[PDB]
Design a protein around this ligand. Structure first.
Ligand SMILES: O=C(c1ccccc1)N1[C@H](c2ccc(OC[C@@H]3CCN(CCCF)C3)cc2)c2ccc(O)cc2CC12CC2
Ligand SMILES: O=C(c1ccccc1)N1[C@H](c2ccc(OC[C@H]3C=CN(CCCF)C3)cc2)c2ccc(O)cc2CC12CC2
Ligand SMILES: N[C@@H](Cc1c[nH]c[nH+]1)C(=O)O
Lengths: 235, 227
């Protein structure tokens, strides 16, 4: 099914799978402050993670995998997906991170939490990189889907596992075909298509680097829950 | 000014720049032990770092950067380069890591140490992935050069790095075209190769988190550049 989609049908399915932009809580009895900042950001990420589950299930080829492999892929990629969504939202807001439309934070508000501004600056630089590249929404949904399928594919031996890995790489190839088709459709020459494809995928290495640094920072302050939403019934 | 090379001359320059395969400073006659296994791997990595400097100087476009940028890229990419070099030489040794011709280890020698077997397995999975794609030497040296130039970039200095990165991308595509790959197979394989770099970054982050669980590395890298 997923391997027979055209590039336009793959763009359409990814654009349609896009989750909504969530808001920070409008609690007057909890106004924004340095103390309540991480509580608001954690609550926002928790609500985003629920929508990330539905988005993943709508990425073509994802539900063809076993849920154990669906859980592992999302366990490996969830923070990367949150960050690239943040970086995408903040593209039009230089020097600031748009966590939510009602939660636009500048660099100085990150200094209140120790260790935050280092991750803050890396997210800002990625947003500047996307801005300088004029990243398109059709390219963004492809990059996010690549992260979902690639981040955990090297950390799964059984015959089933060999079929799953081959399928993940077959779907990743079709996203690559989709990215190139979007670049050819935009007028880029073949040399420019390969060059921009390389530039976009090399940004994924930095997003992984930010994720690892973000995991150490967050731990300095999921599997069962990921399963519970992914292991839905048909009632 | 290295942007005036051809794809074939880019390959030839990177192949000629390959560092030698160093040996473990290990007594082939004294008994082996796991307590001395970090000392051998730290000593080997320190000696490989010097030859990594010589290799980086010969990556086309690297010396065009300032010494500040050359050191910053080396300080940010050195662990990734050691890892992918290890993965490259451990390819024909499935289930094993060939740190040196006299230092071949399997999983069980890594289990003796807290936190090693996790990175050991990720390194083995990368070697298996290289073995499945049948990675060529001309592709491997292009991947190492991309790691050197990409691992620290995130104004005209960044522009020059991106132009050289763009040329290595053109070199990789030219390599697969000369191999007979179709245009679809070319950009598919290029994507597969560059997506492996995200896993190598992941291993480097966990490696730093592992290895580092007085003299700054930049001072040592600067001194190595004087030879
Ligand atoms: O604050 C920060 C931040 C930190 C340092 C520098 C700059 C920014 N973050 C935010 C964040 C907080 C907690 C979290 O994870 C917390 C547990 C993990 C699941 N939770 C467990 C319970 C299961 F739901 C709790 C994930 C994300 C957040 C929110 C929304 C967004 O779009 C993006 C981000 C990005 C960022 C990830 C870097
Ligand atoms: O053992 C391990 C290993 C393998 C599996 C699981 C866990 C660990 N490693 C080895 C390694 C040891 C110490 C290093 O960092 C030492 C710094 C301490 C002062 N140094 C800086 C100042 C003086 F230079 C550097 C780096 C590399 C090593 C050696 C050669 C190779 O090709 C590759 C590797 C790979 C590697 C990185 C994963
Ligand atoms: N699976 C149900 C929807 C549902 C949600 N919760 C329980 N049931 C139908 O459609």
């Amino acid at each position: 099914l997923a391997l027979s989609l055209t590039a336009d049908q793959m763009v359409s399915a990814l654009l349609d799978a896009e989750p909504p932009i969530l808001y920070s809580e409008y609690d007057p009895t909890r106004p924004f402050s340095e103390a309540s900042m991480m509580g608001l950001l954690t609550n926002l990420a928790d609500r985003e993670l629920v929508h990330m589950i539905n988005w993943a299930k709508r990425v073509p080829g994802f539900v063809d995998l076993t849920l154990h492999d669906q859980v592992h892929l999302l366990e490996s990629a969830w923070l990367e997906i949150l960050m690239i969504g943040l970086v995408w939202r903040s593209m039009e807001h230089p020097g600031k991170l748009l966590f939510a439309p009602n939660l636009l934070l500048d660099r100085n508000q990150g200094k209140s939490v120790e260790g935050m501004v280092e991750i803050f600056d890396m997210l800002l630089a990625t947003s500047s990189r996307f801005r300088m590249m004029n990243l398109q929404g059709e390219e963004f949904v492809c990059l996010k889907s690549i992260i979902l399928l690639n981040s955990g594919v090297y950390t799964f031996s059984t015959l089933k596992s060999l079929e799953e890995k081959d399928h993940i790489h077959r779907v990743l190839d079709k996203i690559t075909d989709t990215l190139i088709h979007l670049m050819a459709k935009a007028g880029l020459t073949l040399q420019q298509q390969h060059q921009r494809l390389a530039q976009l995928l090399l940004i994924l290495s930095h997003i992984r680097h930010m994720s690892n640094k973000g995991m150490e920072h967050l731990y300095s302050m999921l599997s069962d829950l990921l399963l519970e939403m992914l292991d839905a019934h048909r009632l």
